[PDB]
């Protein structure tokens, strides 16, 4: 009507060139660089704070909030790109469905009696991104959450699935997790744990037990299962505990020696 | 008919080029991954 400017027209092959050219610009490299940066910052912070200094809980909470915000950003960016591709597919299908303007179909579209899909309206009507079907649980997040307790004491039992207060009401009765293996009187240089056994092993003597037998029972108690080589994975918690224990024992030995010399 | 013939010949040539460039971009993916590993080695050497 009036000025012959139709609201929308069917897609053209020349316009199809640009439609295929249009894409959402990526953040995969940016996101992975950010993730690696925050992970290495957490790793540095693990031993960065002075052993006598206490109160890393607020910094841990702040870093947890930062990581959660980053993960939410990544999830909604994935939502962005999937929405973009779905919108492109819907628009191309609608354009293919609609006819082509040759003689007066353009006039009909201009008069408004005929309508064609418009990417602007579709992008205005696309649903807002939703952080659904996404879980903010990573190994870095887990170690970040559990590191304050390890800092407080090397032996801790954080899970509260059985009871929110502790493992059993107020008393854990969980014993201690020893850095030095009775089998191998040495710190765990290769901490390997099973998703089923949930026990950390040095693997130096475990390979000797697992050679010649396809599956062998877990030597530790409180469980009964057989595992192979490929069920073992690296557990950062174990060497985190080892490092904090060594650092604390070094600082306490230095303090006691210095005070004893000050006595003389 | 000859327009369709040359169009489908171009389509077949483009599909062959797409397969070859898929192989080439897989080669480039391995190339960039190994270059990234070489950088990880180089950066750790610089660090130490």
């Amino acid at each position: 009507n009036d000025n012959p400017i139709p609201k929308s027209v069917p897609l053209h092959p020349k316009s199809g060139k640009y439609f295929h050219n249009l894409h959402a610009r990526d953040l995969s490299n940016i996101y992975q660089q950010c993730y690696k940066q925050i992970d290495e910052t957490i790793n540095q912070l693990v031993d960065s704070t002075s052993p006598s200094t206490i109160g890393i809980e607020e910094q841990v909470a702040d870093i947890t909030s930062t990581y959660k915000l980053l993960s939410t950003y990544e999830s909604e960016s994935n939502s962005f790109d999937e929405h973009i591709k779905d919108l492109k597919k819907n628009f191309k299908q609608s354009s293919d469905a609609c006819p082509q303007i040759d003689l007066s179909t353009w006039d009909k579209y201009r008069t408004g009696e005929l309508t064609a899909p418009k990417l602007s309206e579709l992008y205005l009507n696309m649903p807002t991104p939703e952080p659904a079907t996404m879980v903010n649980n990573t190994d870095t997040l887990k170690i970040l959450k559990v590191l304050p307790y390890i800092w407080n004491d090397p032996t801790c039992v954080i899970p509260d699935l059985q009871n929110p207060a502790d493992e059993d009401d107020l008393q854990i009765e969980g014993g201690k997790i020893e850095l030095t293996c009775p089998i191998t009187c040495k710190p765990y240089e290769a901490p390997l744990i099973s998703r089923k056994c949930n026990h950390v092993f040095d693997r130096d003597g475990i390979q000797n037990y697992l050679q010649g037998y396809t599956t062998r029972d877990c030597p530790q108690a409180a469980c009964s299962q057989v595992v192979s080589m490929r069920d073992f994975v690296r557990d950062p918690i174990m060497e985190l505990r080892c490092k904090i224990a060594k650092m604390k024992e070094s600082q306490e030995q230095d303090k006691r020696s210095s005070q004893a010399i000050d006595v003389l | 008919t000859e327009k369709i013939r040359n169009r489908q010949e171009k389509i077949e040539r483009y599909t062959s080029d797409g397969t070859t460039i898929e192989a080439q971009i897989d080669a480039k993916v391995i190339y960039v991954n190994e270059k990234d590993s070489e950088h990880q080695n180089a950066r750790e050497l610089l660090r130490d």
């Binding site: 053209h12 303007i101 040759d102 003689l103 353009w106 | -």
Partner: protein, 50 residues
Amino acid sequence: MNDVIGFFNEREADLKSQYEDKKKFVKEMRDTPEFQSWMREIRSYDQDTK
């Protein structure tokens, strides 16, 4: 729109050609050999008036 304006240009060129053909038909409709045969039938009738 570039496609549709080219199409309308060729359509109006065809319309111009058809209009030229109609003008040629109008021109040949007059000054016919039968039109030449006329104006002397009038003379023949004028030789013998009323």
